[PDB]
Ligand binder design. Structure first.
Ligand SMILES: O=C(COc1ccccc1P(=O)(O)O)NC1CCCC1
Ligand SMILES: O=C(COc1ccccc1P(=O)(O)O)NC1CCCC1
Ligand SMILES: [Cl-]
Ligand SMILES: [Cl-]
Ligand SMILES: [Cl-]
Ligand SMILES: [Cl-]
Ligand SMILES: [Mg+2]
Ligand SMILES: [Mg+2]
Ligand SMILES: [Mg+2]
Ligand SMILES: [Mg+2]
Ligand SMILES: [Mg+2]
Ligand SMILES: [Mg+2]
Lengths: 228, 228
C-alpha cells in the first residue's frame, strides 16, 4: 500500500508519526521505505526499530494481561481473545523477520548495520518464543540464539566495548538467556562482563558518547540488581 | 465482522480489551454488541463510551500534534499525513454517530439512557467540529449544540443536579461553548451554575454517590480556574 509513495516522503511521514505517537502508521511507513529496496541509513534503521518495538510492545503487554487472566481462569472467550492478540503479535514478528530476510541482512556489509539487523532478528524470534509452546518452540528459541550469537561474534570483533549497539545487543541477549533459555547464570555472566568491559573503555569517549554508553550500562546494572 | 459472535461474548471481550488497554478492539466488540439490536444496560453504555473516547482521544491528540507542525510549516507530506489522521478520526465519529442514530437514541426512553446517548451525540459532533472548516462546519457546530441542548433539557427535568451523567453533560457542553462556539461567557456561566446547584444537593447523597459527584464537580472547578 506504500508502493506509490516516494521513499523520502515515507521517511518524513515515519518521523511525523513518531511525534504523533502513531506507531502502527510509523511501522507501515518504514516497512514501505524498506520495500523500496535501498539500504537504510543509521537514522532510518533506528526509525524502523522504534516503530516495530512500540507496536509489538503494545501487543506483548496486552498478551501478558490476557495470559494472566487465562491462567487464573484455568467459556472460551478469554482463550479466544488471547489467541487473537497472539496471532496479531505473530504476524507483526513475521513481517519484521521477512523484512530482515528480504533483503536487509544480506545487503548489510558494515558491522554497525549487520549487528543492528541480527540483533533485531534475535529480538523478534525472542518475541515469537515468549508465546510459543512445546518443540515448535525449540527451533524458535534456537533461531533467536543463533541470530544473537552471530551479532555478538561480529560486535566483539568489529566494535568497541562501549558501542551502544553492541551494548544493547548484549543487554537483550542477557534477557533472552534469563527469560527464554532458563539460563540465569549465562544472563548474569554476560551482563557483568559487558558492563565491566564497557566501564574500562569509557575513558576513550567524548562527553556525548559517554552519555549514550552509560545510559545502556545502567540498564545492564538494573538487570543485575533484579537478578542477584 | 462481529455478526457471528454472541452478544454476551462481545461484552465479555470488551471488558478484557479494556484490561489489556486494547481500545480499538474494545470499540469494535462494543459496536458488534450494539449491532445486535438490543438496548444497552448502564454498564454496557459505559463500555461503549470508554472504548470510543479512547480511540478518538488518540486520534485527536495526534491530529493536534500534526496540525501544529503544519501551521508552523505554513512539500505536501505534513498536510497529507494530517489529512490521513483527520479522515480516520472522521470515520470513527461517523461510526459512533451512526450507532446512535441506528437505533440507540430512538429506543432510549429512560432519562439516564436518553441523556447519555444525546451527550455522546454532542461530543462526536464536537470532535467533527474541531477539524471542520468554513460553513460545512456551521451545520456541524449546530448539530453538536442541538444534541447537548436536548440532553440538558431532559437532564434538568428528570435528574437531580448531582447525577454524574448530568454533571458530565454540563461539563462537556461548557467545553463546547468555550472551545467550539467562541462563547467563553456561556461556558463559565454554565460551569458555575452547574457546580453551585450540585453543591446544594450533595447533602442528599450516600458516601459513594458523594464521591462520584464531587469528582466531576472538581473537573468543573478546574475549568473555571483555567477560564477565569
Ligand atoms: O518491561 C520490559 C523490559 O524489557 C526489556 C528490558 C531490557 C532489554 C529488552 C527488553 P524487551 O523484552 O526487548 O522489551 N518490556 C515490556 C515491553 C512490552 C512487554 C514487556
Ligand atoms: O485534554 C483534554 C481535556 O478534554 C476535556 C475536558 C473536559 C471535558 C471534556 C473534554 P474532551 O474534549 O471531550 O476530551 N482532552 C484531550 C483528549 C484528546 C485530545 C484532547
Ligand atoms: Cl476474539
Ligand atoms: Cl554484504
Ligand atoms: Cl499519508
Ligand atoms: Cl422510546
Ligand atoms: Mg522515487
Ligand atoms: Mg496460537
Ligand atoms: Mg551493503
Ligand atoms: Mg445470541
Ligand atoms: Mg479533510
Ligand atoms: Mg426503550
Amino acid at each position: 500500500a506504500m508502493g506509490s509513495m516516494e521513499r523520502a516522503s515515507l521517511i518524513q511521514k515515519a518521523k511525523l508519526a513518531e511525534q504523533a505517537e502513531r506507531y502502527e502508521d510509523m511501522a507501515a511507513f518504514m516497512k514501505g521505505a524498506v520495500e523500496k529496496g535501498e539500504e537504510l541509513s543509521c537514522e532510518e534503521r533506528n526509525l524502523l526499530s522504534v516503530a516495530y518495538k512500540n507496536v509489538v510492545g503494545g501487543q506483548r503487554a496486552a498478551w501478558r494481561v490476557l495470559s494472566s487472566i487465562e491462567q487464573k481462569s484455568n467459556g472460551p472467550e478469554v482463550r479466544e481473545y488471547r489467541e487473537k492478540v497472539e496471532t496479531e503479535l505473530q504476524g507483526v514478528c513475521d513481517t519484521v523477520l521477512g523484512l530482515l530476510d528480504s533483503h536487509l541482512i544480506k545487503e548489510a556489509g558494515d558491522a554497525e548495520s549487520r549487528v543492528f539487523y541480527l540483533k533485531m532478528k534475535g529480538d523478534y524470534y525472542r518475541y515469537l518464543a515468549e508465546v510459543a509452546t512445546g518443540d515448535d518452540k525449540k527451533r524458535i528459541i534456537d533461531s533467536a540464539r543463533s541470530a544473537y550469537q552471530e551479532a555478538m561474534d561480529i560486535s566483539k570483533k568489529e566494535m568497541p566495548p562501549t558501542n551502544p549497539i553492541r551494548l544493547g545487543l548484549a543487554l537483550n541477549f542477557s534477557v533472552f538467556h534469563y527469560e527464554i533459555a532458563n539460563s540465569p547464570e549465562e544472563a548474569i555472566s554476560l551482563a557483568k562482563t559487558t558492563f565491566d568491559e564497557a566501564m574500562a573503555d569509557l575513558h576513550t569517549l567524548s562527553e556525548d558518547s559517554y552519555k549514550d554508553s552509560t545510559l545502556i550500562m545502567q540498564l545492564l546494572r538494573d538487570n543485575l540488581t533484579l537478578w542477584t
